[PDB]
């Protein structure tokens, strides 16, 4: 009566959607996460939705030698 996945793959999927809905659509939703990772991000870069730069979580020290400032000295105090 109830089908067999490896004999009739499409026919099992209809029975499982109808007869085991919570179980079937659990595996469906779980697969959508792997799909959404694969699909939206490239399409986002196609439409020009650039990912935001990361926010600073430490003091942003610039690279290179020190600039040799002149100003705001003890005499100015």
């Amino acid at each position: 009566t109830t089908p067999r996945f490896w004999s009739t793959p499409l026919k099992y999927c209809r029975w499982a959607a109808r007869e085991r809905p919570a179980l079937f659509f659990s595996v469906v939703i779980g697969a959508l996460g792997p799909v959404t990772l694969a699909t939206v991000p490239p399409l986002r870069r196609l439409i020009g939705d650039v990912d935001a730069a990361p926010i600073p979580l430490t003091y942003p020290i610039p690279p290179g030698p020190r600039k040799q400032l002149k100003g705001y000295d003890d005499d100015t105090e």
Binding site: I55, P56, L57
Partner: protein
């Protein structure tokens, strides 16, 4: 006299199962509705957490 029925008889009463299907509880209109609510909410969330992240850049 006695307690007798009206001359022409009483009219028929409703006795069969009535139970009429309403659109409010059919699955197709509800499935469509729940879906549009989650899609509108997911558009509103994707805008808010973007703004929240930008407010955090200013705070830092």
């Amino acid at each position: 006299p006695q307690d007798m029925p009206p001359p022409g008889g009483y009219e028929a009463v409703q006795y069969k199962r009535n139970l009429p299907s309403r659109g409010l509880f059919r699955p197709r209109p509800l499935l469509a509705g729940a879906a549009v609510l989650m899609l509108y909410g997911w558009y509103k969330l994707v805008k808010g957490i973007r703004e929240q992240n930008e407010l955090a850049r200013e705070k830092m």
